[PDB]
Amino acid sequence: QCRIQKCTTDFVSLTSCKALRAYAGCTQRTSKACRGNLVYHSAVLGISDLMSQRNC
Amino acid sequence: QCRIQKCTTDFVSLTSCKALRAYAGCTQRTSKACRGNLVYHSAVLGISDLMSQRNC
Amino acid sequence: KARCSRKALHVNFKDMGWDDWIIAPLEYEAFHCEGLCEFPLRSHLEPTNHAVIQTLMNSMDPESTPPTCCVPTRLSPISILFIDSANNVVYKQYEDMVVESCGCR
Amino acid sequence: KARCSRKALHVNFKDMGWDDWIIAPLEYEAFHCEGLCEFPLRSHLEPTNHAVIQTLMNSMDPESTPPTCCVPTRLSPISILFIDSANNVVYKQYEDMVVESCGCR
């Protein structure tokens, strides 16, 4: 169903504002089918916080 | 059955080689009925380590 | 330097920008776990056998294995009324939302 | 500064002075969990909802809530042949003895 875990695993395992936009797009491509999952909204809020923190 | 948890809780909640001997005695009073429980042997080994560490 | 215990932790869905899809509740007390897991482990912490062995080995040789961590051992669910992916108002019971007991693992 | 992962941790019952009541085995690999639980949490960590919320709130405001801890999420039992309290050789399956997966809680 929802594809938040795949994008999350990719973005995390990458870094183990460069790819933050790519991860935001990966989460946005499944914005409709993930309305309700706590993981998706948490990832969106964390992306917003990282965008507002790195000044970009 | 075994009474290791009561002595352990008492000795821990106390300090939250003074009472180490008292805790060792509390564990020794149930040395026969606790032969097999991992908690009792772990407590005994920790008491021995604390006795050998504090030079007493 | 206290021991593994349960402290208060409030969550506000409205402050997290979730008020657009969550109807009620907008905030709730979730608690959290915090404190040291020193030897020995109490009965109220009800640790696992592996947690006991790791605590003992860390008390013996701290440079050989890290100590056990204070983590939630029992959690209680809460209900959430939210708009789903099809504009349907769903009353769903989300599990593992409120920490009810802490321990060492 | 790595992420929450499973590292090796060997236990030797003979070195712990337990060889007097434990027949076999005298040593075994138990593993342990160690690493940071940074945002976001991977799918392999399969965290709880409370762990997700706490990780998010710690990423937002680190001075408001501590981060989730790396702890064992699934453990496997091992068998132990030991002399009990009545001089009876018992083959007992002890649960939660070997860490098989780590996660954030």
Author numbering:
A (entry chain B), B (entry chain B): 53 to 68, 82 to 121
C (entry chain A), D (entry chain A): 397 to 501
Paper text:
Repulsive guidance molecules (RGMs) are cell surface proteins that control processes ranging from brain development to iron metabolism. RGMs can bind to the cell guidance receptor Neogenin (NEO1) and act as coreceptors for the bone morphogenetic proteins (BMPs). Structural analysis of RGMs and their complexes with NEO1 and BMP2 revealed a common RGM architecture comprising an N-terminal domain (RGMND) essential for BMP binding and a C-terminal domain (RGMCD) sufficient for NEO1 binding. Here, we determined high-resolution structures of all three human RGMs in complex with the BMP ligand growth differentiation factor 5 (GDF5) and the ternary complex of GDF5 with RGM and NEO1.
The RGMB–GDF5 interface is mainly formed by two interaction sites. First, a short linker between helices α2–α3 harbors the “RGD-loop” in RGMA and RGMC (“RGN” in RGMB) and interacts with the GDF5 wrist region. Second, the RGMB α3 helix stretches across the two GDF5 fingers. Under these conditions the RGMB ectodomain (RGMBECD) bound GDF5 with an apparent affinity (Kd) of 8.8 μM, and the N-terminal domain alone (RGMBND) exhibited a Kd of 2.7 μM, suggesting that RGMBND comprises the major domain for GDF5 binding. Mutations of RGMB at either of two key RGMB–GDF5 interactions (Leu103Glu and His106Arg) abolished binding to GDF5. In solution the 2:2 RGMB–GDF5 complex is stable at pH 7.5, but dissociates at pH 5.5, similarly to the RGMB–BMP2 complex.
